[PDB]
Motif scaffolding. Structure first.
Motif, PDB file in Angstrom:
ATOM      1  N   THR A   1       0.820  -1.209   0.000  1.00  0.00           N
ATOM      2  CA  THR A   1       0.000   0.000   0.000  1.00  0.00           C
ATOM      3  C   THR A   1       0.857   1.264   0.000  1.00  0.00           C
ATOM      4  N   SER A   2       0.336   2.318  -0.620  1.00  0.00           N
ATOM      5  CA  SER A   2       1.016   3.607  -0.672  1.00  0.00           C
ATOM      6  C   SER A   2       0.037   4.716  -0.322  1.00  0.00           C
ATOM      7  N   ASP A   3       0.562   5.910  -0.071  1.00  0.00           N
ATOM      8  CA  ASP A   3      -0.288   7.054   0.200  1.00  0.00           C
ATOM      9  C   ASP A   3      -1.021   7.452  -1.071  1.00  0.00           C
ATOM     10  N   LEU A   4      -2.294   7.800  -0.919  1.00  0.00           N
ATOM     11  CA  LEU A   4      -3.062   8.373  -2.010  1.00  0.00           C
ATOM     12  C   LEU A   4      -3.282   9.843  -1.709  1.00  0.00           C
ATOM     13  N   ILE A   5      -3.066  10.693  -2.706  1.00  0.00           N
ATOM     14  CA  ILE A   5      -3.402  12.099  -2.563  1.00  0.00           C
ATOM     15  C   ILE A   5      -4.884  12.287  -2.856  1.00  0.00           C
ATOM     16  N   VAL A   6      -5.531  13.146  -2.080  1.00  0.00           N
ATOM     17  CA  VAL A   6      -6.952  13.401  -2.242  1.00  0.00           C
ATOM     18  C   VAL A   6      -7.160  14.829  -2.728  1.00  0.00           C
TER      19      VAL A   6
ATOM     20  N   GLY B   1      -5.465  16.416   0.555  1.00  0.00           N
ATOM     21  CA  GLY B   1      -4.970  15.681   1.701  1.00  0.00           C
ATOM     22  C   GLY B   1      -4.414  14.338   1.288  1.00  0.00           C
ATOM     23  N   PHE B   2      -4.186  13.470   2.263  1.00  0.00           N
ATOM     24  CA  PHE B   2      -3.649  12.153   1.973  1.00  0.00           C
ATOM     25  C   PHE B   2      -4.348  11.081   2.787  1.00  0.00           C
ATOM     26  N   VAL B   3      -4.237   9.842   2.325  1.00  0.00           N
ATOM     27  CA  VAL B   3      -4.838   8.713   3.019  1.00  0.00           C
ATOM     28  C   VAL B   3      -4.015   7.451   2.791  1.00  0.00           C
ATOM     29  N   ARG B   4      -3.977   6.598   3.805  1.00  0.00           N
ATOM     30  CA  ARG B   4      -3.265   5.335   3.720  1.00  0.00           C
ATOM     31  C   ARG B   4      -4.150   4.244   4.288  1.00  0.00           C
ATOM     32  N   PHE B   5      -4.382   3.203   3.500  1.00  0.00           N
ATOM     33  CA  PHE B   5      -5.166   2.071   3.961  1.00  0.00           C
ATOM     34  C   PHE B   5      -4.225   0.947   4.350  1.00  0.00           C
ATOM     35  N   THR B   6      -4.722   0.007   5.142  1.00  0.00           N
ATOM     36  CA  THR B   6      -3.916  -1.136   5.531  1.00  0.00           C
ATOM     37  C   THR B   6      -3.962  -2.181   4.432  1.00  0.00           C
ATOM     38  N   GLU B   7      -5.142  -2.366   3.850  1.00  0.00           N
ATOM     39  CA  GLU B   7      -5.344  -3.393   2.834  1.00  0.00           C
ATOM     40  C   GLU B   7      -5.254  -2.811   1.425  1.00  0.00           C
ATOM     41  N   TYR B   8      -4.380  -3.389   0.606  1.00  0.00           N
ATOM     42  CA  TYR B   8      -4.189  -2.935  -0.769  1.00  0.00           C
ATOM     43  C   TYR B   8      -5.470  -3.068  -1.586  1.00  0.00           C
ATOM     44  N   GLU B   9      -6.331  -3.999  -1.190  1.00  0.00           N
ATOM     45  CA  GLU B   9      -7.625  -4.170  -1.837  1.00  0.00           C
ATOM     46  C   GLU B   9      -8.431  -2.881  -1.733  1.00  0.00           C
TER      47      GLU B   9
END
Length: 77
Positions: A1-6, A46-54
């Motif tokens: 998983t990687s950070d997603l920009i919002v 902003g940014f977001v990081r999930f635990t699951e790549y799904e």
DNA sequence: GTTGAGCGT
């Protein structure tokens, strides 16, 4: 998983709001709303990081209605 | 007290 920009966040949207929203898809590690350091006014992204790549691809694949505006989750540059 | 393509000390 990687950070997603919002991109496109309403100025009123808070990290609390993002957490709530994004949690509906999957487990969230962290969220950020970038703000001007002097005024605290949100810069609209902003940014977001999930635990699951799904959850990440699921979220990355669609637009998001957040607090009245369509937002986009991309991979940063 | 504003805005809407914006990428993070």
């Amino acid at each position: 998983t990687s950070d997603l920009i919002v991109l496109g966040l309403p100025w009123k949207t808070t990290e609390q709001d993002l957490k709530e929203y994004f949690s509906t898809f999957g487990e969230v590690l962290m969220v950020q709303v970038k703000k001007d350091l002097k005024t605290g006014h949100s810069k609209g992204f902003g940014f977001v990081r999930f635990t699951e790549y799904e959850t990440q691809v699921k979220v990355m694949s669609q637009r998001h209605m957040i607090d009245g505006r369509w937002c986009d989750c991309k991979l940063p540059n």
